[PDB]
Amino acid sequence: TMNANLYKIWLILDPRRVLVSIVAFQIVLGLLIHMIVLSTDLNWLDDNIPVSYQALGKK
Amino acid sequence: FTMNANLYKIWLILDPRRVLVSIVAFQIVLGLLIHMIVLSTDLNWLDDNIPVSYQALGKK
Amino acid sequence: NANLYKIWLILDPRRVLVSIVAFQIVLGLLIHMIVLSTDLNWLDDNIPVSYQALGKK
Amino acid sequence: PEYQNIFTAVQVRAPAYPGVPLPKGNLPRIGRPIFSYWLGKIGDAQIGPIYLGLTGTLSIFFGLVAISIIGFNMLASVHWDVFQFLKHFFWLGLEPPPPQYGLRIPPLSEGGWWLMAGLFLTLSILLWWVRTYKRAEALGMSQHLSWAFAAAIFFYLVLGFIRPVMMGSWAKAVPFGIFPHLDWTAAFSIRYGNLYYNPFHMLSIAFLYGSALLFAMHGATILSVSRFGGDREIDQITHRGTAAERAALFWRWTMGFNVTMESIHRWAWWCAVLTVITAGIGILLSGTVVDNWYLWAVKHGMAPAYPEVVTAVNPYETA
Amino acid sequence: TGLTDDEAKEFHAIFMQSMYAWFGLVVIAHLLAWLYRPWL
Amino acid sequence: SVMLLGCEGPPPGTEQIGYRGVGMENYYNKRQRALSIQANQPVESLPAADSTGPKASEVYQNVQVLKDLSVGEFTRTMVAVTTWVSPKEGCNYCHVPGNWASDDIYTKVVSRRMFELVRAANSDWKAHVAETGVTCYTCHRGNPVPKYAWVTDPGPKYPSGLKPTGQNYGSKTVAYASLPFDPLTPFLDQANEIRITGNAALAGSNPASLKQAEWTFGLMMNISDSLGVGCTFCHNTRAFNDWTQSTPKRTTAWYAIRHVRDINQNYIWPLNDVLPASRKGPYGDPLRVSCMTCHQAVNKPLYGAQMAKDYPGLYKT
Amino acid sequence: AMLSFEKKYRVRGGTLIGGDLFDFWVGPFYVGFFGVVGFCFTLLGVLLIVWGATIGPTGPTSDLQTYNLWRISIAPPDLSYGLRMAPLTEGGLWQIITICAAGAFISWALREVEICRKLGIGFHVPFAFSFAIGAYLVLVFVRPLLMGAWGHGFPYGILSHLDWVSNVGYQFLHFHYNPAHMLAISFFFTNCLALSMHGSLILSVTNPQKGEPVKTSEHENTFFRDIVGYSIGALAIHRLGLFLALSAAFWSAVCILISGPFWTRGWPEWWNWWLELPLW
Amino acid sequence: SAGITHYIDAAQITIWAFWLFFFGLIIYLRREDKREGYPLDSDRTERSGGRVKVVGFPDLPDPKTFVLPHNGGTVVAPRVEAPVAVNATPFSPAPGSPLVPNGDPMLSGFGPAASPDRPKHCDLTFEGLPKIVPMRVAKEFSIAEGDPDPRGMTVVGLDGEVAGTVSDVWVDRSEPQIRYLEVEVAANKKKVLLPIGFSRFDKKARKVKVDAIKAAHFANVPTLSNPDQVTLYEEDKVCAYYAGGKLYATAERAGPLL
Ligand code: BCL
Ligand code: BCL
Ligand code: BCL
Ligand SMILES: CC[C@H]1c2cc3[nH]c4c(c3C)C(=O)[C@H](C(=O)OC)c4c3nc(cc4[nH]c(cc(n2)[C@@H]1C)c(C(C)=O)c4C)[C@@H](C)[C@@H]3CCC(=O)OC/C=C(\C)CCC[C@H](C)CCC[C@H](C)CCCC(C)C
Ligand SMILES: CC[C@H]1c2cc3[nH]c4c(c3C)C(=O)[C@H](C(=O)OC)c4c3nc(cc4[nH]c(cc(n2)[C@@H]1C)c(C(C)=O)c4C)[C@@H](C)[C@@H]3CCC(=O)OC/C=C(\C)CCC[C@H](C)CCC[C@H](C)CCCC(C)C
Ligand SMILES: CC(C)=CCC/C(C)=C/CC/C(C)=C/CC/C(C)=C/CC/C(C)=C/CC/C(C)=C/CC/C(C)=C/CC/C(C)=C/CC1=C(C)C(=O)c2ccccc2C1=O
Ligand SMILES: COC(C)(C)C/C=C/C(C)=C/C=C/C(C)=C/C=C/C(C)=C/C=C\C=C(C)\C=C\C=C(C)\C=C\C=C(C)\C=C\CC(C)(C)OC
Ligand code: HEM
Ligand code: HEM
Ligand code: HEM
Ligand code: HEM
Ligand SMILES: [Ca+2]
Ligand SMILES: [Ca+2]
Ligand SMILES: [Ca+2]
Ligand SMILES: [Fe+3]
């Protein structure tokens, strides 16, 4: 649908700005996710399983 | 857009580059702003209710 | 993969390169940490044995 | 009633000068330099462009990370409710690890993000000193910034790697917030005697003063004789003139002795460096060395002695 | 800007296929996690 | 987030705590020192006592705290112990409609204790309470529930199970500053050490975490605020520890920081059972006692007025 | 004596309020109508104070009375004598000294001016110095007045004057939150940064790499146009400077003129007007 | 610390350290301070201080070699200098007494309007062309979009009465900042460079008042050898003049007020 009349977009918007702005946004945003999520209950690193190989092996 | 049809004129006084880009940002921020202000107090599906078992029950 | 090549005609390859190299250096230094900090501190805490705990004492 | 070089009255402009080109290795400069009449009503109205090498990016990256931590964890605090984040801003922050994990990697929670974020404001900061010496001499320029930067970067480490980690305490290392950080200095003064008694601070002060003094004089002086190209010091350094003539002379018939359009710039770079130098000094001694500088002082015959119109009692003794 | 209509439409096309490249690789990403750890 | 110039017109207060030109000084806005007095006013005691009569343990079915008192004097007490406490609800507040010997009212149960509180205090800690001693008007100042209590502060909201730090916030608790925002509970309630000064000049002594003195501060803040006097008042700054250097006041505060230990860990604490929820805190607790609770930003609650002196039944016998 | 080229500037006159009399030099200093006076106060101070060093706390005999800069200090009178001459022994002397020191900085300050005239230069120097001068008044005058006490100022102790701050500072608990003290501090910092840059850069262009030309602005104006991206300019630095400092001072000046006579609560509190905003 | 010896520990050592290397580096500067202008000239007085050394306690440093830019001689320091003239007479023979500017002081070239003889070679830009030039060659420039163009502003003596007008405002290729304004005087019908530093803008009346020298003095203003560029030598030359005005343009100025 959108694509046909959306090529004209790059006719006012520089390819570099979109290429540069998007990378910056996708990554910082990507980071602010696992990040804001990691600190959230569904944490995965030290939250639950697999079997406490640390608690078992350590002591 | 019964009235917002005669608006066509605006574009010359409102630069396309200035209005296009700048508004795509205000959105890019408010996007996070809202999800944050709402995620903060209203309800927090992330730590509000189950599934939140694996964290406590699944942990130890 | 076919059409992906054309990107080099608008963006300075050297740029994206040095850009990528710096991105993978911090991240890795981050991850190993962001994990070693929480997931499994494989370095100090479980193995092999406590030469310090059962030894020093 | 003479135009006292305050704000460049009438300005003028010419194309964007992307500086002297660089050798084989210094990647392309970047940016489409801009102009700001206002900013320019004080200095070079042109803006940019700026360089960005490896450490350039590498450092900047290691930069907006700690920020994205010390920034995040902070917001989290006021439970992601910005409104208050905005309110309790100057109060918020991110504290270090609890006295337990003295040096051990703190858990993902208890002071963890701070050690994480910290190290990333440990490298990027140290990496940016590289983004100097590097871009510095690759200009055919000697090194005096790079130098000082260290002196300063020294003190920063005297507030971390070198001392906090030197006393086994992921606590003895400053917090991470305006107020709280504003508190650390407060807390410190106490925990150990009272800094006003550790010479290396009462010292590092006189400097933070001198700079607050000199670069404050020579800033004027220059101006005073800025009509006579004083501002052009560059050449005045080489080919003198009425500038350095009228100037130094002033101080000659004032405080007596005086110096040169060169020399001054020396003491400048010095007092400055000789500041953070003395800073990290005391801060390094204070901790693993003397524990109470007030006691130190008097014990050396330093600390004064006044009469006594008020005194108290001591429970631990009578009780 | 800095271009004409020709070069413009060509970019947009390839540029799209590359965007659906993401959405698909990310949606499939979400889904894989969605199966493992259910959020909500 | 902007620069400012004092919002109080001069000239202010002027107390020279220390030797001519040394430091410790004290400044207060008259325009406030005023109101604060004209407002923190004591309510004149009841008319003279009877002196006559037998006792009260005698005539009254059950009167343990005020048994030695003559009926009349004893009654003065009830009246007082009303206006000082709930002169909005009347006698019935601590009693049942009619039957006065009833102990079917948690208000009374405690009221009882509140008596063992005051007196015990007024007589055994006179080193802090001195001759002004305390009354019910103090903490209750015309109110059943002291507006100045303090349930262990939960802290600000929790981020997905993750907000351990208890320093950064800013809460009136501490004259306003990013601090523990609750030095009380671990101090005024419990009794965590408060000293941190290294006893000897060099190292090899005080191994106290800075963080530790980092807490003393907050505490100290509150204290200093409660009474409403700068640390100069009890301290000689450079000498936060050199007592020989401090001022009388200090020691006079020392005890206080224990008479409270007492009051909380011995009285207001136990009585939590008889106390409903509306007086219990989130972490489940009893509104104990801050120095503020009485002091209310003053040095001698109601600036030295000694109400308790005009009530004999308010002193351990 | 004279500098290699000084011999040619020592014109005649140029004085301010008279001075065409003592309008001459001594060593490398111009006297005039102010080099003269300032001197007076100097000894009737630098030495008048000696008397103090002699006298000490109790008396010139008290084991308390010493001769170690580290301890020696002249203490102001008790708040008692409010805005009145105190007994030298009890306070006045302190006042006396301070009396002098005032002029000694008002003279040398002005003397600077006469000079600034002779050498037909700009006056940015004195004008600057004045702030620094002032900050000394609004910190032993403008304040103590709105405190009705001269003895309410500060001492004159090599380090003794330190505590005087220690106290008056804590008199508000966390003095640190004082809005001014924050900025005023910030400046005394920014200054000590730019300075640690200009004075550096220069000494890095005029004396650049080995076998290299005395670089030109065509570098400087780019040195930071690379690292930081933008360059305030060269003329500018010698502006931002005076700015920072001549502000930092005037700031701090406020900083302690309002602390007390304009605010009695602990600063930390002042910061409350913020919180209480009908918004968050 | 003032008495002699009391306590004894570690850190107190170090305080001695820095506070030693300081008194060392202090000298370093002293020397580096002396480069130019040294040694001193006359015996009008001796060296004031603790130890009155021959000429400064820190033995004058050695020659420094300044490798100038392309097509430029080399400068050093110290570097003996050839004595100059003293167009003035001592009001008094007393050491430290002033020297009156013989004849017309306005140009007598003394103190208030004296100056050194800087190199007679226009200081150039980065590659070659000379930095300070008039807006003539400085054609690739443009007034700051907004600031009222000074080209056409009538200068006005400190006496008020007009004194010629302006022409080209000598910009610079190094920093887009105006440094001079061409002033086609009124009587001389010549060109006298106006040192912006001395020029006070009055964008309200197109004027540019200069409280430095009377309108007439624009005639005695050191004339520029070439109008398309100015050399360091003269860069100091034009300036120094107006400077004098500060203490010459009126009998008032120079003499005390009270
Ligand atoms: C949270 C629960 C799950 C989990 C669920 C998810 C989910 C769900 C997703 C991820 C995704 C990602 N996860 Mg994960 N993840 C977990 C644990 C981890 C851990 C870990 C140590 O435990 C790590 C290190 C990661 C790391 C990562 C990243 C590799 C990845 C992308 C993020 C992003 O912002 O892209 C942003 C992108 C960009 C900046 C680049 C722009 C993209 C375009 C198309 C390419 C640019 C074109 C250019 C012009 C051409 C030049 C080429 C080169 C640049 C030179 N996850 C846990 C177990 N993770 C995302 C993903 O991988 O999707 C596929 C995703 O959707
Ligand atoms: C609140 C409880 C719900 C929830 C409710 C909502 C609601 C309600 C809404 C969202 C919306 C959004 N949510 Mg949600 N959301 C939840 C959980 C999540 C989680 C999560 C990890 O748990 C994530 C990652 C998201 C993520 C998102 C975003 C996809 C989306 C828009 C964001 C934005 O502002 O960009 C902003 C915009 C721009 C940058 C630019 C403007 C767009 C224009 C049209 C095209 C760009 C044109 C340009 C000029 C051309 C050049 C192209 C390139 C820029 C180069 N939600 C929970 C479960 N979410 C919003 C949404 O998706 O609406 C569709 C919305 O309304
Ligand atoms: C109690 C401890 C408090 C505190 C209490 C105070 C108090 C109390 C005061 C300050 C003041 C100041 N503090 Mg504080 N301050 C604290 C911590 C700090 C910290 C820190 C990093 O921790 C910093 C950076 C500062 C910074 C500052 C400055 C902004 C400010 C002004 C100093 C000044 O230069 O006056 C400039 C002064 C002068 C120019 C006068 C002296 C010069 C005269 C004119 C010439 C002398 C000639 C001589 C006699 C002749 C002999 C020749 C010799 C060779 C010299 N404070 C702690 C928290 N601070 C002061 C202030 O605000 O003043 C306005 C002040 O009163
Ligand atoms: C006596 C020594 C004085 C001193 C010297 C000194 N400082 C220096 C130097 C020197 C010699 C440098 O060379 C260096 C400099 O400026 O180099 C160009 C510097 C410097 N001194 C600085 C700061 C500083 N110096 C201070 C003090 C001092 N420095 C002393 C007074 C102070 C204080 C505490 O008063 C501060 C705050 C920096 C400006 C700079 C060092 C910069 C550095 O290392 O940067 C590393 C990279 C980053 C931090 C990444 C930045 C990320 C992005 C570019 C910004 C994006 C926005 C941001 C994250 C805001 C948040 C927004 C969010 C919504 C995303
Ligand atoms: C922001 C402004 C900064 C500044 C600027 C500044 N200072 C200046 C100037 C300027 C522009 C000068 O022009 C002037 C100068 O050096 O001129 C050649 C000067 C000066 N700054 C000086 C000092 C000074 N400046 C300081 C600070 C600052 N000065 C600020 C940081 C400080 C401190 C503590 O921070 C000091 C100590 C002097 C060296 C000099 C002014 C000299 C002068 O006029 O002296 C007159 C008097 C005497 C030589 C004899 C003294 C006899 C008196 C009767 C005794 C006074 C006693 C005193 C009050 C007690 C001191 C004891 C303390 C330890 C408690
Ligand atoms: C027992 C016993 C010994 C008792 C003592 C008894 C005694 C001695 C009694 C006598 C007491 C008396 C009368 C003392 C007064 C004696 C006098 C006149 C002392 C001099 C006073 C005085 C102000 C000295 C200077 C103070 C100092 C050193 C301040 C340091 C601040 C500082 C770093 C200044 C920098 C100085 C310099 C290098 C200035 C030069 C300088 C500057 C600053 C430029 O900006 C500039 C710009 C462009 C070209 C050139 C220059 C230039 O040359
Ligand atoms: C949610 O956030 C959003 C997305 C909205 C973005 C906004 C972010 C914001 C607003 C961020 C704001 C950040 C602020 C205001 C930060 C302020 C910081 C301050 C005031 C800091 C003050 C002092 C800091 C100091 C002294 C830090 C010192 C750190 C040190 C010494 C770190 C050392 C680290 C070392 C030595 C690491 C070594 C590696 C290991 C630990 C492995 O060695 C054993
Ligand atoms: C003015 C109205 C009041 C009257 C007439 C009144 C009357 C009495 C009487 C007659 C007794 C003794 C009864 C017995 O046990 O035999 C008594 C006891 C008591 N009253 Fe009241 N009372 C009044 C108000 C209050 C109030 C407001 C309180 C609340 C704090 C209170 C607290 C007590 C207590 C604690 C006792 C037990 C005394 C003791 O143990 O020493 N009374 N009252
Ligand atoms: C001797 C006079 C006093 C009497 C008769 C008295 C009486 C009472 C009563 C009846 C209650 C329970 C009220 C209710 O909720 O129904 C109460 C609660 C309380 N009192 Fe007192 N009191 C006296 C003095 C004090 C003093 C001097 C303090 C201060 C340190 C104090 C602190 C408290 C506190 C903290 C509570 C708990 C708050 C509540 O649950 O309402 N009281 N007092
Ligand atoms: C807000 C400013 C204040 C600060 C920063 C402060 C700080 C301190 C510190 C650090 C200590 C421990 C010293 C040591 O033994 O190592 C201390 C102890 C003490 N302070 Fe303060 N203080 C303040 C206000 C006050 C006030 C207003 C009083 C008086 C009522 C007071 C009374 C005491 C007492 C009695 C002790 C010793 C007993 C103890 O608490 O363990 N302080 N203070
Ligand atoms: C730990 C917290 C507290 C501290 C540090 C403290 C400290 C002090 C100090 C230093 C004084 C003497 C002031 C002076 O000499 O002028 C004082 C007086 C007094 N305090 Fe407290 N106090 C505390 C808690 C309390 C509490 C909870 C009460 C209430 C029951 C109280 C009631 C009083 C009264 C009535 C006086 C005045 C005695 C007089 O006039 O001499 N204080 N307190
Ligand atoms: Ca949920
Ligand atoms: Ca392990
Ligand atoms: Ca803290
Ligand atoms: Fe300079």
Side-chain angles (χ1 to χ4, degrees), chain A residues 1-50 53-55 57:
Chain A
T1 304
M2 59 186 257
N3 321 51
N5 275 334
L6 295 191
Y7 77 74
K8 306 170 183 176
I9 291 185
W10 323 120
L11 280 171
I12 283 194
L13 308 184
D14 289 298
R16 302 241 200 202
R17 268 103 144 291
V18 307
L19 302 172
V20 183
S21 64
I22 294 312
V23 182
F25 189 34
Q26 295 303 283
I27 175 221
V28 62
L29 162 58
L31 243 63
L32 174 57
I33 301 305
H34 291 74
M35 184 56 100
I36 188 171
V37 178
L38 179 51
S39 58
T40 297
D41 295 310
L42 54 156
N43 192 297
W44 64 67
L45 300 310
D46 78 311
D47 73 310
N48 47 43
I49 60 159
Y53 40 52
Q54 186 182 304

Side-chain angles (χ1 to χ4, degrees), chain D residues 1-4, chain H residues 198-200 209-211 246 253:
Chain D
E2 217 77 58
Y3 174 124
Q4 215 87 197
Chain H
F198 273 65
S199 65
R200 156 171 56 178
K209 185 177 178 177
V210 179
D211 182 65
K246 297 279 294 185
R253 299 187 176 191

